[PDB]
Structures are given as structure tokens and as C-alpha cells.
Symmetry: D2
Subunit: 243 residues, 4 copies
């Protein structure tokens, strides 16, 4: 997270951390608890090439990474079959937990938006994670969960910004219709935040609008953060996750 | 270049090296001389973002990098407007030199293929360059130009390989129709070879079939190297370079 | 620490961590609390060149680095004037804290040895710290304090080992008389453990025999760890620290 | 070499490069041809631990490293038996070549000084090598041999300078009697120049005064380059090398 601060312990009860087996169970990507037995994340965290399930675990909301880990095994990785790279799109994946989590006020699910939900330009949303704090700047120990408030950007404007200072033809889409943009040169998600949630409070209810997907660096001029648009893939999500 | 060997001095008179300004004028991609005032390279080497032309120079065929440099400045960088990433396609670009080069038996242009040549499996083709000699292994000093003979794999077969060990659906195309596949687990191009030539001997004449573009690593199982298919982009090239 | 295990919370109440200011207050050496206002460490951790005192802080016994830091600033750095490198000797230094620490069962001083204790082979001795767990392997998060029991090797025997596989003449002393050897190819201190304590239980009391100083790598054949012999430097220490 | 320039091809016919076996025969240290069958170098380049002779070769004077290598095998490494580290001293070694070199005006021996030779403070001398061009700045390709003119410094002054900004007692020697100092904040030897020659023209004859040994960084305030004093070790040298 670039330009944020450390999150209050009471906030973001759905945030998860994805961990890969090595010398330790290291954080590589974020995710969100969308049902007691399912995590929503980015396909590029876990694909497109097939991964060993035994080398992956999930960690539920933690103030500080690694300090009080209680690692959860995963029973299935479901990567959207249209995914090959984040720039092409379909950057979305599900992880089915081995058990349902017992929900509490401290760890619980996020609400998905209705199909019709339009998160309008300017709407204040929040992105969270334990990613880098700037380009090539790691989150320092003790690895607090960070948050930053970022406004939704309209696709057409976000696409136009990506074309400024580029050779790419103006009518050739960079930011595609299954993607959503947020952030500026002071506030953004960054590497390690991938797969985590962009959430917006709509009439007082928190809805997950996006999944951290990609961008050109973090907080760079004319290069807002790009997210997979959750509304776009609701039907695919609902094919596996109970409503 | 993975596999193969140091090129004889008499071969590949069209090979160029692209250099970026820093503590020294460092090699970062290859290219080919297609006209005395024009170099053909990969878009990903010089885009999609606009770079400072003053910080780019070209070196004509050299047996060893850096030893006998005579760097040439560039007046224009022209990048295919469809280009955004190598995995999407249109990985092709042109550099106009500030002056025409004087040609000779040692340094001269390569012939572009007619629109109809398809470069089928079994054709004798070579890829050349100063890139890495295996995944994450640098070409050692004194940096000789390398060459390797690479076998063509038909696009549909190549695409099908790219789907083995992938989540990507089998009918979601990975290797696109403007690309070409060649190489195996002993013979391939690698990082630093990008933008250079794949040339095939057709009826006694060397034609440039491909521009080194991408792949999943270098010389990995089921993952041939991918080239930009030059025939696909002949009309574009001819918008800029005289016939 | 190579080998051994995470220390129980009740053990080594004297262990400290030295921190250098940067993107975070990073652990770079250990130390020991020898008086409420004084820490004993290795000279090589803080010298021979004079450093900015404002950029140094000390953390008292913590089970996990960084998680619950309460950093304490330093008023004086006193380095043995014979010191230039660890291989020459006099690898010993004192830090005066700006305030006295409040002691308890969890955090308190270690007892210095009488001038006459020699710490012979067979004595039960432990070395503790947050350093590397093998040559060039970092202690992973969450950075637990480690301990390992290390066997003492008599100085002359240790010196003779240091000469095996060396050009150095056998009568040119390597392990000097102000040093002490301990450890083997399974149990040793390592980088990041420097400046911390080697403690040996003598007649029911824990005494600090050694300060972690140097060695040829960590847990390597014929190369025990080398410590600064605390008894050699008692008079110096007592020039500064009250009895 | 810090602050130098590329050497004329006619200069320094005694300079050699020491090469270690890996992915290529990489330069690690300098040396000097002091007899047709012997190279003078620093012991820290090849010790104090015993090295495999088969993994070492010598390269005679070359304008550019790696370009025209003709690598020479070594038949004996002789490391001064008093050597353990450069800061202690005796940082001097001999390599006996498998054959005598055939001398020419382009490659030939350097003259050693007489025992009595005093290279006085201020005398202009030259150091040469293919080392780093500043702290942590590698010599760029095509790796030219560099030179820089450096004045001799008196030991007592050099020792005093090393004490400025240090905790080390003023009467505790840092720069020892077998060492010689030269250089300033604009001109110095650096890592990779080790073992190469410091040469001074005395009444029109070039004599080797020093062997590049160590220092605190390169070209740092109050930290001149330190060399092994060749006069000090003449008798040891003459024990193996014919006069
Ligand atoms: C994940 Si990749 C490594 O991405 Si790119 C550097 C190619 C990339 C393409 O578009 C981009 C657009 C942006 C960024 C970028 O700036 N990022 C940093 C910031 C980050 C980020 C993350 C989270 C949030 C935010 C928002 N602020 C940003 C997103 C990535 C990176 C990119 C990649 C995608 O598909 C691939 C397919 C293959 C490979 C691959 O294996 N290689 C590349 C090709 C190479 C090769 C070279 C020559 C010849 C051959 C033939 N043998 C091979 C071998 C190694 C790599 C990839
Ligand atoms: C200890 Si240092 C960093 O030197 Si060494 C790595 C060659 C060393 C000398 O003896 C040793 C003996 C052992 C080890 C070693 O193996 N270690 C790894 C393990 C570690 C350790 C730590 C804790 C516990 C244990 C026990 N298991 C071990 C101790 C170090 C290392 C060494 C050193 C001491 O005094 C110095 C003074 C100066 C410098 C220094 O600044 N430089 C070296 C010289 C160099 C230079 C080169 C050519 C010309 C010039 C002139 N401009 C300069 C510039 C950079 C470095 C040092
Ligand atoms: Cl919340
Ligand atoms: Cl040819
Ligand atoms: Cl204890
Ligand atoms: Cl000369």
C-alpha cells in the first residue's frame, strides 16, 4: 500500500494473506473472505500455471504478518479459465478452504455487490494489504496491515491516462471492460497487495468493488491502479460460491 | 541464446545491438538492419512508454560487445500502435537512424519475406544474439554474438503445448496468429535476444521470419520461444521503410 | 544462531538487540545488559569509526523482533581503544543508556565472571541471538530469539584447527589470548549474533564468558566460533561501569 | 582505480590479471611480473586458506580484459606465512608460472627497489588495475586497464589519518611498518586492484614500491590507500625469485 497508514484492528475483517512454502510461510498476495469457506483473489497470484496445493496456505486477518499465524490449508484453486496475464484480463481466482471459518466480528466475510451496482467515479473506496509501500520499497517489519482511501476512476478516463506518454494507439484499449481503476500519485496498491480487496461503502454498507490486479508501477503519474471489476465476474463467482 | 555457439565473423551482417545510456552504453535488446536507415526490433524493447531518444544508440554487427563500439544515434522510434505487451501481440517496432549506414559484405541488410511465406516445420532457421545463455545466466565476457539453429513448431501445436500445465482454457488462444514458435529445451532465444532476428534460408536466400519476442522462460518443457511473425506486419513496415 | 531452538520467554533476561535507523529500526547486533544503565557489546558492531549516536537505539529482551518494540536511546558509545578489527582483538564496547532501565524477572542484568574463571572444555555454555541461522541464511519472520548450547574448545586446540587448510604459519597465532572458542559444525553463532552473550552456568550462577565476535563463517569444519574473552577486559569494563 | 584514466598501450608492461575458474575466467586481483617466471601479488587475493591451483590462471598485460585472453597456468602459490588478514599485514604472495614468459617491450618485468630505497613523501607514483572505479562501482565493459597518479604518504601521517573519526587509541597502530600509503579523495586503488603494483619512477627508473593491499573504502576522507611495502619483504621475495 502506497500512501496509507496502518489499519485499526477493528477494520477489514475479511482481509486475508496468501502464503507460499519455503524457509518460512511467506506472504505473496492478498485475498478476501467472501463466504466462510471461500477466498477471492487474483488469478496472477496463483496462475496461469498450475501450482502445488500443499505449498499454499491462507491466513485470516492479522494485524502484523507472521506474529500470530494460524495457517489454513486450501482444498481447491479455481483460476478463471480466460486468465493468461493481468493485461489481458480475467485476473480473478477462488480458493476453497478445507473447512469453513467460524465467523466473528473480528473475522468475517465481505459483501459482494449486486450485478447492477455501479461504483461511480469519485466514490471513496479503500484498498488494504501488506504490499510494498512504494516501487521496490518493501513493507518493513513488523508488517502491519495498511489501508488507503482511493477514489474510483471511470474506465474511459483511466484508459486515456494509460495512453498519455505511450506509443499505443488511442483506440486500442489498455484498460479493458472487466477492469476498474482507482488511485493517484499519492495513494495506490502495489506489489504484494495483489488479489486483495478494493471496498467501497455504499449507503453505509461495505461492498467489494475490485480485486487488486496490476498497473504500471505504483503511484506513478498517469498510471492509476487497476483492479478486476467484481461485478463483471459475479456469475462466475456464483457458479462456485453459495449465495 | 541457449545452446548453439559463437557466430563466425562472416555470418549475420544484419545483426544489431540496442544500447541504453548509463554508466556505459549497455546492450539491452537486439535488432536487424532492414534498410540503411532503418532497424527492425521488438516493441517491448522500446515501448509501450515513450523513451528519450538521446539515451538510445545502435551498434552495427560486432563480434564482441563493447570492444570496438561505434555507436549510432536514432532520429525516430516508431512502435506498432496495437502494441501494449508481448503476450497480447504486435511486438514490433522501427528505429530510424540519423544517417544512412554504409553497407558492405560485413554489415548489410536482411531481406524481408514475401507476404505469402508461412515458415513451416522443417525449415532451417537460426536465431542470433547477445542475450542470456540460460534462464537467469548472463552471456559471459567477452560477449560473443551467438547463433542457434531452432526448429519451427506449427502455431496450433505450439498453442496446445502452452496450455499443458496451465489453468487457461484450451480454447483461449495463447500463441496468437501474429506470432511464430520455434526452439526446444536445448535451443532457444532468451532475455537480451529480444528484438533480434529469426532468419530462415528459403531457396538460397535468408529471409527474416521472426522478431524475438517472448516465451515462458528459455528452453523450458512445452514452452517454445515465441516470435513476432514478420509477414503479418509487412504493410505496416512499408508505411515507413522504402522498398 | 546455527542449530539449537527458539528460547523460552523466561530465559536470557539480559539479551538486547541493537538497532540502526533506516526505513525501520533494523537489528544489526546483539548485546547484554550488565548494569541498568549499561550494555556490553562487540566493538566491531559500533566501530572502529565513530557513528551518530542518534541513529542507534537498543531494545531490551523481546521474544520476537520488531513486534513489541520500545526503543531506548544511547548517551555514550565507548569502544576499547585497542580495537581495530575482530581478528586483531579487543572486540569489546559499552553503550551507556540515557536512562537506567527498570529491572524485573523478565529483564535484568547478567553477572560478569571473576577474573580467575577460565571456562574450560566441558562447561555448559549457551549463545543466544537473532542472527543468521546458517551462512547467508536470514532468521525468518517472526524473528524469534534463538539459543544453542555450544561446546568450549581450548584456545590452543582452536588455534591449531584454524591453521588446518591455511597457509598461515603454525606458530603465527590466529586465535589470540583475549579470545575464547566455542561451537562446532552443528552449533554456532552467526552474523547478526555479534555482540551478544555467551553465558556458562558456574556453581548455579550464569556468568558471561564471551561476547560474540567472529569466526570463518558459521558452523564450518575446523572453524569454531570465536568470542571476546570477557575476563580479559574486566578492568576496562570497570573503568566505566559501577560495581 | 578511482579517478584515473585508461592507460596507453605502451605503459605498464608488467601488469597482470589473476583469473578464477567459473562460468568464465573472471578477474579477481592484479599482480606484477617481477621475473619471467614469477608474479608478485597480495596474499589476501589467494589466501589465507589454501586454494586449488587448477582454478587459477594468470593473464599478462592486456588493454581490455577478456578480449584477447591467453591464460597461463600457475605451478605454485607462495603466500607469506605471517599472513592472516590485510589489517595485520604480511599481505604478499608469489605465483610461480608453469613456464617463463618470453619478454618483449610490450610485456616485461618490473624492477624491484633496493633494500635501502626510501620512497619519500610526495614522490609521484602510479597505481594500475582493472578494479572498481568507485565504492561499489564496477569497471564497465570493455574493461580497460586504468592508471592514476598518487603521491606517497609518510606512515606516521597515514596512521594519524586513519585515527581521525575513530575510537582506536592514537598510540595503537592501524597502518603498520610493513605498509605504505598513497592516495586521496580523488585518486586511489579499489577492490579488484588488489595485488597489483604501485610503481614510482626514481631518477628515471620505474621501481615497484607497493602491492595494493587494503584501505577503508576507496577515495574516502582521511583514508588513503594502503599497500604492502615491497622493501620490507625483499628478502622473503629473494628467497624464491632469482636476482
Ligand atoms: C507477470 Si510478467 C513477468 O509481466 Si511483464 C514485466 C511481461 C508486464 C507486462 O505488462 C505490464 C504492465 C505493468 C507491469 C508493472 O509495472 N508491474 C509492477 C507493478 C505491479 C502492480 C501490482 C499490484 C498493484 C499495482 C497497482 N499499482 C501494480 C504490476 C506489474 C508489468 C508488466 C509476464 C506475463 O506474461 C509472461 C509470459 C512469459 C514471461 C517470461 O517467462 N519471461 C518473459 C519473456 C522472456 C523471454 C525473452 C526472450 C525470448 C524468450 C524465448 N525463450 C523469452 C523469458 C521470461 C513473463 C510474463
Ligand atoms: C572483517 Si572485514 C569486512 O574483512 Si574480511 C571479509 C576480508 C575478514 C578478515 O578476516 C576474516 C575472518 C573471518 C571472516 C568471516 O568468515 N566472517 C563471516 C562470519 C562472521 C561471524 C559473525 C559472528 C559469529 C561468527 C562465528 N561463527 C562469525 C565473521 C566474518 C571474514 C574475515 C575488514 C576488516 O578491516 C577492514 C578494513 C577495511 C575494509 C574495507 O573497507 N574494504 C576492504 C578493502 C577494500 C580495498 C581494496 C583494495 C584497495 C583499497 C584501497 N582503497 C581498498 C575496500 C573495502 C574491510 C575490513
Ligand atoms: Cl471494515
Ligand atoms: Cl548470414
Ligand atoms: Cl536464563
Ligand atoms: Cl611503464
Amino acid at each position: 500500500i502506497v500512501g496509507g497508514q496502518e489499519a485499526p484492528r477493528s477494520k477489514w475483517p475479511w482481509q486475508v494473506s496468501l502464503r507460499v512454502h519455503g524457509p518460512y510461510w511467506m506472504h505473496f498476495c492478498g485475498g478476501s473472505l467472501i463466504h466462510p469457506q471461500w477466498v477471492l483473489t487474483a488469478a496472477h497470484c496463483v496462475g496461469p500455471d498450475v501450482k502445488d496445493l500443499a505449498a499454499l496456505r491462507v491466513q485470516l486477518r492479522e494485524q502484523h504478518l507472521y506474529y500470530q499465524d494460524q495457517l489454513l490449508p486450501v482444498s481447491r484453486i479455481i483460476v478463471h479459465p480466460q486468465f493468461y496475464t493481468a493485461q489481458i484480463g480475467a485476473d480473478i481466482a477462488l480458493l476453497e478452504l478445507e473447512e469453513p471459518v467460524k465467523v466473528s466480528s473480528h473475522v468475517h466475510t465481505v459483501t459482494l455487490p449486486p450485478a447492477s451496482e455501479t461504483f461511480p467515479p469519485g466514490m471513496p473506496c479503500w484498498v488494504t494489504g501488506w504490499g510494498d509501500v512504494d516501487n521496490d520499497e518493501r513493507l518493513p517489519p513488523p508488517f502491519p496491515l495498511k489501508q488507503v482511501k482511493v477514489p474510483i476512476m471511470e474506465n474511459h478516463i483511466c484508459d486515456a491516462k494509460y495512453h498519455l506518454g505511450a506509443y499505443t494507439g488511442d483506440d486500442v484499449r489498455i484498460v479493458r471492460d472487466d477492469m476498474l481503476c482507482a488511485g493517484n500519485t499519492r495513494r495506490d496498491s502495489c506489489q504484494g497487495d495483489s488479489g486483495g480487496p478494493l471496498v467501497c461503502k455504499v449507503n453505509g454498507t461495505w461492498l467489494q468493488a475490485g480485486v487488486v490486479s496490476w498497473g504500471e508501477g505504483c503511484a506513478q503519474p498517469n498510471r492509476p491502479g487497476i483492479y478486476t471489476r467484481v461485478t463483471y465476474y459475479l456469475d462466475w463467482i456464483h457458479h462456485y460460491v453459495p449465495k
